[PDB]
Structure 1
Amino acid sequence: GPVPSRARVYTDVNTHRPSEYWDYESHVVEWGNQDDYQLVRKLGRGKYSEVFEAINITNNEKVVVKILKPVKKKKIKREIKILENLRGGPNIITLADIVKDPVSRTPALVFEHVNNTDFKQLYQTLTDYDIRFYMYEILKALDYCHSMGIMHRDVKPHNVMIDHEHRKLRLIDWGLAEFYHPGQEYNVRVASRYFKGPELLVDYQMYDYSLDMWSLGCMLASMIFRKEPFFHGHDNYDQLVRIAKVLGTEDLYDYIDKYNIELDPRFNDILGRHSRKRWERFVHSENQHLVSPEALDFLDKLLRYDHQSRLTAREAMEHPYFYTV
């Protein structure tokens, strides 16, 4: 079968903690009364959630209410436990309360309010310094949650809230987050297509915090090159082909041979043969003001097939690309 693998950092953080910390199935959730909140307006809508802006009528403070469709109760317990464990961590969305409406009994999570700025509106106004500044803020959140033995497993621009006026950033939507246990085989149906690491696309289940570093690399590549998304797959199989068109099919086979991975037969007719490209090839007149040798070197160290060779969040924070922050 496949060769086992483990994280290069924070490997045994959950092993050395009592079960209470990571055993979310045993976690007792206490659901308060949603009458303390008045819903103001709808902000967004997910596959299993609906996000509203609301007011806490006991202190007149704005909050964000995430109403969850109870499609899987174990998944709701997992998200709550992780949010409670990470509560107050740097740049982590702050869970303020857990409530249920008395008549509907629908689970709802109450968070600190964030005055988000638009992704398209920010895209063209962001300077090189801004990109470094906010990349460093996400790394603070990732190094923290990895140190707490949690993999976000859903990093993408939609899951990063920014209040640009206040230079405030929050990593949100922990619904896909999981506790890291060395040697554990995880479900690969995580994250979002454009941000899925090659480990997920080749069905290598023994992945770790390094999956987040791949997703972060995809975000960085989209920001510096103004190409959104950077790896534009049209299905999960095609996604690996788009990565292969940049990283090359030679290093893909070296990766699958190193871990004795069995490639799905659906790859047979679509994978082809591709050369490894130079990061400089993506530089153009519209994006050259965001690109630098430091940015390309940092990107090259995140976007690697081999999950074990990618920079850890702590190694990434020490990169020359961040010397100016």
Structure 2
Amino acid sequence: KEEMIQLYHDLPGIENEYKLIDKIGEGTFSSVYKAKDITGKITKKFASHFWNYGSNYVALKKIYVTSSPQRIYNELNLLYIMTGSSRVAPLCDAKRVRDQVIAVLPYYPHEEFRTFYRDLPIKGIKKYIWELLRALKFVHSKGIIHRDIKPTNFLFNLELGRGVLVDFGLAEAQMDYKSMISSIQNGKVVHLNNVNGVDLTKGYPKNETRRIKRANRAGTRGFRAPEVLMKCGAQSTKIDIWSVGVILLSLLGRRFPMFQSLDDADSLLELCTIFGWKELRKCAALHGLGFEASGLIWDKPNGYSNCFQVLEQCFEMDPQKRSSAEDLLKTPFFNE
């Protein structure tokens, strides 16, 4: 109600361009409204889009002014160039003013994902993963890593079976090129092994982890890959498929609060709780950086199992085992 008037006051153009229908959602990164997109609006400009290939309702994405121009521009350009088909959201236009901006992204009817999360047959989940993993393969063909994979990031509609990606601001690319032209008491260091107390004994010695490593850590907690959790300086592609595996573990388990973690160390402790800290230390070591979990309490091997086996055996955290998207597609999911 107040939304139409305030948006008209800020942007008089939309008052004549569109009559805003109503608001359909509020994101932590932007706002989403639904508008009746029938002005002249050439159907060619609004054609070849995942919805019905015509001219009809277009959601308006109000982007918060706080976001950086470079970030918003990368998003609005990867909408335009690298996403125009293959079950992806296309963008046709955008309205800009001195400060604030809106994107014009065709509306896709959907429903809340918490409604059908425990009363849906297996075949529906099969086709859901089919659609998601096809979109993932197209994204990797484009060469970008989504890096922010969560249920809201992919809108779905069961009535029409529609599925489209959204809330993907954290999409970025791999290095895409690698160049190798050539090739007793001393202090608090005594704490356990030397390495435990090297940090304390000296005055904030060095600072590499957050200064010269500084890696990348963006996304949602509880969906990160072990390499990201360990803050490694090199990750190639498999974070997305690890997140997909987390999603399928969530869907095989009928319980709404899958993870309550909100910290990196807490998430790592959760991963050690679910899977043996022995193999966690093995993976951390083989990644190229050390690991030491001396926590006495809660060290016994974790319950591993106490369709399920085949779905649970596809969680391999090192880059020498796991396969590609079509490889996961090859498993039977397409009965008739």
Scaled by the length of structure 2, what TM-score is found?
A: 0.73
Q: Is the 8 A contact 1:82 1:174 kept in 2?
A: no
Quick one: which of 293, 304, 316 aligns to 1:304? 316
Within the alignment, does 1:108 sit opposite 2:109 as a pair? no
CA distance change for structure 1 residues 45 and 241 in 2, over 3 Å: closer, same or farther?
A: same
Question: How far did residue 272 of structure 1 move?
Answer: 6.0
CA distance change for structure 1 residues 121 and 183 in 2, over 3 Å: closer, same or farther?
A: same
Quick one: which of 49, 56, 69 aligns to 1:73? 69
Alignment of structure 1 residues 48-197 onto 2, 5 Å? 48-58=29-39, 59=41, 61-70=56-65, 71-100=67-96, 102=97, 105-182=99-176, 187-197=215-225
Map of 2:327 onto structure 1: 315
CA distances 1:236-277 after superposition (whole Å, capped 9, x unpaired)? 2211211222222122112111121255x9x87699635254
Read off the aligned partner of 1:189 and give its amino acid letter. Answer: R
State the alpha-carbon separation in 2 of the partners of residues 246 and 183 from structure 1.
36
Within the alignment, does 1:39 sit opposite 2:51 as a pair? no
Read off the aligned partner of 2:261 and give its amino acid letter. Answer: G
Read off the aligned partner of 2:59 and give its amino acid letter. Answer: V
Read off the aligned partner of 1:212 and give its amino acid letter. Answer: D
The structure number with the bigger radius of gyration is 2
Residue segments in structure 1 that go unaligned for 5+ positions in a row: 1-32, 282-291
Question: How far did residue 206 of structure 1 move?
Answer: 1.5
State the alpha-carbon separation in 2 of the partners of residues 229 and 204 from structure 1.
28
CA distances 1:119-167 after superposition (whole Å, capped 9, x unpaired)? 1211133111111110110000000001110111111111111111001
State the alpha-carbon separation in 2 of the partners of residues 237 and 148 from structure 1.
33
CA distance change for structure 1 residues 96 and 228 in 2, over 3 Å: closer, same or farther?
A: farther
Q: Secondary structure at the match of 2:105?
A: strand
Q: Is the 8 A contact 1:152 1:174 kept in 2?
A: yes
State the alpha-carbon separation in 2 of the partners of residues 270 and 195 from structure 1.
27
**Bigger relative contact order (CA 8 A; separation at least 6):** 1
State the alpha-carbon separation in 1 of the partners of residues 326 and 146 from structure 2.
16
Quick one: which of 276, 282, 285 aligns to 1:248? 276
CA distance change for structure 1 residues 309 and 186 in 2, over 3 Å: closer, same or farther?
A: farther
Within the alignment, does 1:206 sit opposite 2:206 as a pair? no
Residue segments in structure 2 that go unaligned for 5+ positions in a row: 1-12, 42-54, 179-212
Q: Secondary structure at the match of 1:141?
A: helix
Q: Is the 8 A contact 1:49 1:67 kept in 2?
A: yes
Identity level (%): 26
State the alpha-carbon separation in 2 of the partners of residues 271 and 112 from structure 1.
53
State the alpha-carbon separation in 2 of the partners of residues 53 and 93 from structure 1.
15
State the alpha-carbon separation in 1 of the partners of residues 25 and 92 from structure 2.
19
Q: Secondary structure at the match of 2:252?
A: helix
State the alpha-carbon separation in 2 of the partners of residues 83 and 273 from structure 1.
47
Q: Is the 8 A contact 1:151 1:209 kept in 2?
A: yes
